């Protein structure tokens, strides 16, 4: 019906969608409009909400609809499509739809097949056809999804048990995992080589009398009977053995447990709203139909709707691989499951206590139980053994109605199949909850449109084709997958944007989880809390955290692998404290000698080696070879530890278009994608299985035809770039305006030490006596451990072993812990004879002698991946999160009146630090890894900033612990409420794709088109120095203001934001379980003992010498009161926005605000000139230098707008961020018409003086005597210049040159002659712009039918 | 066979109005509609406009529409481009070819081509 | 529609398959069902000779060596034999929407 004034228009919060514009045969904008004065779910006791009830409430409370546009912007009728009564438009023999462009679609008199059931429903994402522009994908998600932020449904936290001695926070269940005194006999046995010399190598394998070289023999065998009465059948299964299992917490053994969340029926376990078959059953009601609107605005019949086609979430969960419905389940089996389950860590690959979101129990199946395979048996063979379908089934991963209407949204049509990619999640998200885009749907049409099929392939299917060489910038990353796709890629999807043909699928992206991949040691648990909780999905941070002491060597041991037989604290140097230092060379004596042995064995005789290899690395070792790093071979992900939480990268992906349009409904999956049905099965399993024959989920691996993580760049260079990155929370770079090689930190309130570049912090050592070897001389970074040389006064260009190791000293160090012993072998005429103690002679030491000389989370060695820390996973994850601001930042003061971090509790030249590098406070433990702690501290809080200037700053910050006190510190996240789903609608700008990620607009500009040198990415972040755009900033739903991000008529990026809830949600703070907090991520306490900064008790007195040892966190070391305050995000916000001054401008108080994004200049992100001796690190270090601010105030960064127009990162800009007065609850843009909420002037398209000649103007008869094809052309479909006139009103103002006369239907036998009058709008108005439907010509609109009546 | 003989190349000083010939030949001038091309020299042709001959209408696109004028006499199957006041972009080679709406051929019998160059 | 027509210079020897690709931003199908896309070529010092006419079809007196085929946006002519009279710049021209836009041009060379 016509226009519903009591609707306005409105943004649909998971795509940033408000209004599709239509530029060509159908014009204007179909925008979504609401009752945006109904309070949705009775909101403006935490009950719970039926969602039947809630659903028939909103239905009969708020009123949706499709208003449609003209092209001009005013507002025509709406589509409401509860009050519509709509009918199927007829077709003729060809299948096209019967379409008069007057008589509009041929109804059929019938509504569409179960429309009744449809009707209420909501649209939320219009997507015109390119095959027919009066054809649109209406997206159609119940009433509540509009409103289910309103709803609250906030993650829980387990429950506590209560007082605990583990000093655990959030529920958190830790503790340190016991040797299993029954089970002590599953210990791995060490097997000698079979061939080849006793010595005294006692750090092996040999105990005390063996001194044997010994691998560890896992053997996992079938029993000899081959006989299937009992299918196939396990004697002997060593990844079963479990030596160390859970510790019995209290006498019930400490346990991830659906209950720890409590029970559905006050902590209330989240399940999610709906489940997946609760959405199967009753689609019309509860999936996100796509209605096939056929629209037609000046036509009698204007709408016609002719298929509903329920995206049904079963739909996807179809197509979900295998492996998907046993996800507490990896192809590492039961080694993995039982590993994390005694490290109380998420077990398989998505697990229900991470990731709720895609399970129809939520947190009610949120454990390590029920895995669909045999776990707890009495017999350890037969664990391991998948469940029957008549046993308890798993909790499969599945699309329930968070994680459902999350992949709801995005609509791109693409020839007869419209792809759903899905939204960002913030339509279902809340701040605990992370409802990503698990997959795209596909309403796949035939030609005619009467059929259609609706299908969705998993991310990780359309993904599983990702590669190294796909991307221009990080490689390595955590997307590579696996045949049972244990990486499961879940997008805040900013949209499916074609940029001409390529299709691409922008936003932000959950890689496979890095932060849990290094599996801590069993009984490292109670002192590594941050890792636990980030491993038993309780902290939500996908970001690494840097607590790497408590790491096992590596995470691929199974627990038979991880005590050793002997009274040593592990099982090294199979599984031992992760120390790099300790690491074996992989020279040719120590792999010959370690791994040669069994390397040809492992597999072979259904008996792997776990080498006596000393295999150790830091944080980029530990992703590199056990996070779902991404390689040259596409699925060759033999390790994906789990899935991030949250989206933890930046994404973009030119998918074919071509292939998803054509790929298959039903996916069909090989036995190689189910996970094995049997542990020897599993054992036996390769990691690269070819896909069997009738399957199609291999067809999927070429629609990522290319992808990018934002910037085209190494990691370190991306370091630099991260560190150019302003945080959005007070606008102050991540480098601290750090001038690289030219700050005072080199050894020779303006700058202060850089959070994750390395260039010009520390120590300028030379690489090549490191590790044994261009000359690559590297930057330490901040919390170097170089050894000072025999003179003293020049520090060693590398760490020396026996510093890191503590064997200077030759007892209970932090560089052995593990009593780990100096190891040499001596080839004696291929008799590679190992033995204890220092090399000496020939005899060729197994550790390296010369190592990194930076451990610390700012480790960053190319030529040294074990121990390199910043990995381009975590760099990923950190220009994510600082796009976000979100990123954790480890303090141990938490800025109140006694736990105040100073300006003189931090240093940062290198003159303070050479002395004490305590005073550069980098905890090297705790703090999120790959970056500077003491520098995101800087960046957050200013500290240092305000003490200089003068101390305004909040005191928050990390501060080494001195003399005896306990840094019982925590990661807090700064305060902004930006989420990795803060992701706007994609745009295309040029060869450029844009979306808002959290208040960046982030600009893909040689994506696409990739350009040589190019950073890859524009960024433009709200000015946090600007009151009103910090405000936004500093919002508890910051992503509730996000309305658009329109490429405008300029190719720049104008993103909407509605300050209204900003400002709302500022006044509820002034007046007024985890924190609602989108960013409360419940960090647990990092305690560090003062010592573990003091490791002297000679040539190395650096702190970080050794990797930091926390103490075992206790009761005692809980954290302080107020800095427990601070790990809810909401406190750090206050202490922040109070540092930041209280101006509050209300003059007068902007209800919306468009940021612009500035006119990047050519060399916007261009390193060609840049990169063309210096490494390319240090080459766009200086070049972001040079364009830093050449030289605090309220602790905001002053919007310079230096190297906005040169880097291409910057903030916005005052006149780019334009403060508009009304509110913004949609945004109407039709190609001409700009209207915040529909209101303002709208467009014209040109003067009301050209109007079609009424009917009795025009002759009839001459006009009509001759044909009516021969008066005008009928393939031009224009009127011929010379009977324009004899049409419509031509004034002499007008020149008649302006005006064509588009035909829209010419009909000989009746003589009818129907005529879209197009005025000719000139591009920025020689003659060039685009002949647009003057909507003034008639009353009716553009379109008059002169036929003889 | 359906044959176009346009005007030859063609000296013209910018601004000054002058008719490009296209004499048709082998076929009905009225039937089947008359289009312009420009080609600016190492440039892609550019489709200046359509004319009926059998109503003398015209269908310009908008580049070339205040720009060049065409008409047709029937008397002698002739079309016509009248370029008004021609600038620097203004030269080119200026094609007229028949076109086919029977069998929806754009164009296809184009003329030889009338070298048109604007310098003064 | 937005013109693009790739390659700008096709690189072809004697007797070989030139596949000229004209790629669009929305069909080009006509109101009236017949896509409009027709494929000349022009030979140096010679007229625009038409050779595919409604996108597949043939145009008369123009060899079968020529062969124009898609749908939609996508339009590519193939040639499976290329002789010295296909030297000449080809153009794919759109007259399903005003203006009627020529390709780029591409400019069949012999592939020395």
């Known amino acids: 019906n016509a226009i519903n004034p009591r609707l306005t228009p409105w943004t649909y919060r998971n795509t940033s969608f408000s209004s599709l514009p239509l530029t060509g045969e159908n014009p204007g904008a179909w925008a979504l409009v609401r009752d945006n004065s109904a309070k949705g779910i009775t909101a403006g006791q935490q009950t719970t909400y039926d969602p039947t009830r809630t659903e028939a409430a909103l239905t009969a409370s708020t009123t949706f609809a499709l208003r449609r546009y003209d092209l001009a912007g005013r507002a025509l009728y709406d589509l409401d499509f509860s009050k519509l009564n709509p009918q199927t438009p007829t077709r003729d023999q060809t299948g096209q739809i019967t379409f008069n462009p007057f008589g509009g679609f041929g109804l059929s008199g019938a509504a569409p097949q179960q429309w009744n059931e449809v009707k209420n429903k909501v649209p939320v994402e219009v997507a015109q056809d390119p095959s027919n522009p009066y054809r649109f994908a209406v997206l159609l998600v119940p009433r509540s999804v509009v409103y289910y932020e309103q709803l609250q449904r906030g993650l829980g936290l387990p429950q506590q048990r209560n007082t605990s001695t583990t000093g655990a926070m959030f529920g958190l269940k830790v503790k340190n995992a016991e040797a299993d005194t029954a089970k002590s006999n599953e210990k791995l046995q060490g097997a000698e080589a079979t061939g080849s010399g006793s010595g005294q190598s006692t750090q092996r394998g040999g105990s005390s009398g063996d001194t044997k070289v010994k691998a560890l023999k896992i053997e996992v065998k079938k029993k000899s009977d081959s006989e299937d009465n009992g299918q196939l059948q396990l004697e002997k299964n060593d990844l079963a053995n479990a030596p160390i299992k859970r510790s019995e917490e209290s006498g019930q053994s400490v346990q991830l447990k659906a209950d720890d969340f409590g029970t559905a029926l006050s902590p209330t376990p989240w399940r999610p709203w709906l489940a997946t078959e609760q959405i199967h059953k009753d689609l019309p009601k509860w999936s996100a139909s796509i209605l096939i609107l056929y629209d037609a605005p000046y036509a009698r019949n204007r709408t016609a709707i002719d298929r509903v086609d329920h995206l049904d979430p079963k739909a996807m969960t179809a197509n979900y691989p295998p492996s998907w419905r046993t996800p507490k389940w990896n192809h590492h089996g039961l080694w993995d499951w039982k590993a994390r389950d005694v490290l109380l860590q998420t077990t398989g690959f998505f697990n229900p206590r991470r990731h709720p979101e895609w399970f129809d129990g939520g947190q009610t199946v949120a454990d390590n139980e029920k895995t669909g395979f045999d776990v707890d048996n009495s017999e350890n063979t037969k664990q391991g053994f998948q469940k029957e379908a008549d046993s308890d089934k798993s909790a499969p991963i599945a699309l329930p109605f968070e994680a459902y209407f999350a992949n709801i949204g995005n609509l791109t049509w693409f020839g007869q199949a419209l792809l759903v990619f899905g939204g960002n999640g913030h339509v279902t998200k809340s701040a605990h909850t992370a409802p990503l885009s698990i997959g795209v749907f596909r309403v796949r049409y035939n030609a005619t449109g009467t059929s259609a099929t609706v299908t969705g392939w998993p991310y990780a299917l359309l993904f599983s084709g990702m590669v190294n060489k796909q991307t221009d910038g990080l490689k390595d990353l955590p997307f590579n997958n696996n045949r049972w796709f244990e990486y499961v890629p879940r997008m805040a999807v900013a949209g499916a944007k074609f940029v001409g043909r390529e299709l691409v699928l922008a936003g932000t992206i959950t890689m496979g989880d890095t932060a849990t991949v290094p599996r801590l040691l069993y009984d490292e648990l109670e002192s590594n809390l941050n890792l636990v909780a980030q491993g038993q999905g309780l902290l939500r941070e996908d970001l690494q955290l840097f607590t790497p002491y408590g790491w096992a060597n590596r995470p691929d041991l199974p627990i038979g692998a991880w005590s050793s037989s002997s009274s040593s604290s592990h099982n090294a140097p199979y599984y031992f404290h992760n120390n790099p230092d300790w690491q074996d060379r992989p020279i040719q004596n120590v792999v010959d000698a370690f791994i040669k042995p069994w390397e040809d064995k492992n597999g072979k005789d259904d008996a792997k080696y776990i080498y006596p290899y000393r295999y150790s690395g830091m944080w980029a070792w530990q992703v590199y070879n056990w996070s779902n790093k991404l390689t040259d071979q596409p699925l060759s992900a033999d390790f994906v530890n789990e899935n991030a939480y949250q989206p933890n990268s930046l994404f973009a992906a030119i998918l074919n278009p071509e292939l998803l349009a054509a790929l298959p409904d039903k996916v069909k999956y090989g036995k190689e994608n189910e996970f094995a049905a049997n542990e020897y099965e599993r054992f036996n399993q390769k990691l690269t299985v070819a896909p069997t024959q009738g399957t199609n989920w291999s067809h999927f691996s070429p629609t990522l035809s290319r992808f990018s993580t934002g910037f085209n760049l190494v990691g370190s260079v991306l370091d630099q770039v991260l560190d150019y990155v302003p945080w959005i929370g007070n606008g102050y770079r991540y480098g601290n305006n750090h001038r690289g090689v030219d700050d005072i930190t080199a050894p020779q309130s303006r700058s202060f030490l850089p959070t994750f570049s390395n260039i010009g912090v520390g120590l300028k050592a030379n690489v090549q006596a490191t590790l044994g070897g261009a000359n690559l001389q590297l930057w330490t970074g901040a919390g170097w451990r170089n050894d000072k040389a025999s003179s003293g006064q020049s520090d060693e260009n590398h760490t020396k072993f026996t510093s890191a190791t503590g064997m200077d000293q030759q007892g209970t160090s932090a560089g052995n812990p593990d009593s780990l012993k100096q190891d040499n072998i001596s080839k004696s005429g291929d008799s590679l004879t190992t033995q204890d103690g220092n090399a000496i002679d020939q005899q060729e030491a197994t550790n390296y002698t010369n190592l990194p000389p930076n451990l610390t989370p700012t480790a960053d060695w190319p030529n040294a991946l074990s121990f390199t820390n910043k990995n381009n996973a975590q760099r990923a994850q950190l220009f994510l999160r600082g796009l976000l601001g979100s990123i954790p930042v480890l303090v141990n003061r938490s800025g109140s009146d006694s736990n105040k971090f100073q300006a003189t509790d931090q240093k940062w030249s290198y003159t303070d630090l050479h002395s004490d590098q305590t005073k550069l406070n980098l905890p090297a433990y705790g703090e999120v890894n790959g970056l500077l702690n003491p520098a995101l501290v800087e960046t957050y809080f200013g500290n240092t900033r305000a003490g200089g200037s003068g101390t305004s700053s909040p005191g928050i910050g990390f501060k080494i612990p001195e003399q005896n006190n306990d840094s019982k510190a925590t990661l807090i996240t700064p305060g902004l409420a930006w989420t990795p789903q803060d992701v706007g609608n994609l745009v295309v700008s040029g060869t450029t794709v844009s979306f808002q990620l959290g208040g960046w607009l982030v600009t893909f500009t040689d994506f696409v088109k990739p350009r040589a040198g190019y950073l890859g990415l524009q960024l433009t972040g709200l000015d946090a120095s600007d009151a009103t755009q910090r405000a936004l900033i500093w919002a508890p739903r910051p992503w509730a203001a996000f309305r658009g991000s329109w490429v405008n008529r300029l190719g720049r990026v104008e993103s909407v934001w509605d300050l209204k809830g900003v400002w709302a949600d500022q006044a509820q703070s002034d007046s007024q379980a985890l924190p609602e907090h989108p960013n409360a991520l419940a960090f647990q306490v990092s305690v560090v003992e003062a010592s573990a900064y003091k490791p002297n008790t000679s040539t190395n007195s650096s702190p970080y010498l050794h990797l930091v040892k926390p103490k075992k966190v206790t009761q005692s070391d809980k954290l302080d009161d107020d800095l427990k305050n601070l790990l809810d995000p909401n406190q750090v916000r206050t202490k922040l926005r109070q540092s930041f001054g209280t101006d509050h401008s209300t003059q007068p108080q902007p209800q919306s605000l468009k940021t612009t994004t500035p006119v990047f200049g050519t060399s916007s992100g261009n390193l060609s000139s840049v990169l063309s001796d210096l490494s390319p690190v240090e080459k766009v270090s200086g070049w972001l230098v040079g364009q830093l601010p050449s030289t605090s105030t309220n602790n905001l960064a002053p919007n310079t707008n230096t190297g906005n127009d040169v880097v291409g990162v910057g903030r916005l800009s005052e006149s780019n961020a334009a403060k508009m007065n009304d509110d913004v609850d949609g945004i109407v843009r039709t190609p001409l018409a700009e209207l915040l909420d529909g209101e303002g002037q709208t467009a014209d398209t040109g003067p009301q003086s050209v109007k079609f000649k009424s009917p009795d103007q025009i002759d009839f008869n001459r006009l009509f005597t001759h044909p009516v094809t021969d008066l005008f052309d009928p393939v031009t479909m224009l009127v011929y210049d010379q009977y324009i006139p004899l049409f419509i009103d031509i004034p002499a103002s007008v020149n008649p040159k302006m005006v064509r006369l588009k035909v829209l239907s010419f009909d000989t036998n009746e003589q009818s002659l129907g005529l879209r009058l197009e005025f000719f709008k000139p591009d920025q108005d020689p003659n060039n712009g685009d002949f647009l439907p003057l909507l003034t010509a008639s009353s009716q609109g553009p379109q008059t039918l002169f036929s003889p009546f | 066979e359906v044959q176009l003989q346009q005007s030859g190349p063609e000296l013209v000083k910018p601004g000054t109005s002058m008719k490009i010939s296209c004499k048709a030949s082998?076929?009905?001038?009225?039937?089947?509609?008359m289009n312009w091309v420009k080609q600016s020299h190492g440039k892609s042709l550019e489709w200046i406009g359509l004319?009926?001959?059998?109503?003398?209408?015209?269908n310009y696109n908008q580049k070339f529409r205040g720009t060049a004028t065409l008409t047709v006499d029937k008397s002698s199957s002739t079309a016509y481009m009248e370029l008004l006041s021609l600038t620097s972009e203004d030269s080119a080679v200026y094609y007229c070819?028949?076109?086919?709406?029977?069998?929806?051929?754009?164009?296809?019998?184009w003329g030889q081509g009338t070298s048109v160059t604007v310098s003064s | 529609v937005l013109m693009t027509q790739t390659p700008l210079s096709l690189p072809v020897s004697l007797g070989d398959q030139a596949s000229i690709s004209c790629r669009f931003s929305?069909?080009?199908?006509?109101?009236?069902?017949?896509?409009?896309l027709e494929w000349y070529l022009q030979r140096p010092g010679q007229s625009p000779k038409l050779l595919i006419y409604?996108?597949?079809n043939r145009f008369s007196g123009v060899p079968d060596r020529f062969s124009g085929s898609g749908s939609g946006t996508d339009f590519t002519l193939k040639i499976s034999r290329v002789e010295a009279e296909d030297l000449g710049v080809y153009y794919c021209?759109?007259?399903?929407?005003?203006?009627?836009?020529f390709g780029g041009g591409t400019k069949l060379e012999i592939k020395r």
């Open positions: 082998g076929y009905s001038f009225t039937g089947y509609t």
């Open positions: 021209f759109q007259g399903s929407h005003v203006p009627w836009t």
């Open positions: 929305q069909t080009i199908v006509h109101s009236n069902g017949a896509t409009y």
């Open positions: 070819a028949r076109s086919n709406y029977a069998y929806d051929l754009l164009m296809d019998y």
């Open positions: 004319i009926n001959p059998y109503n003398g209408g015209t």
């Open positions: 409604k996108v597949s």
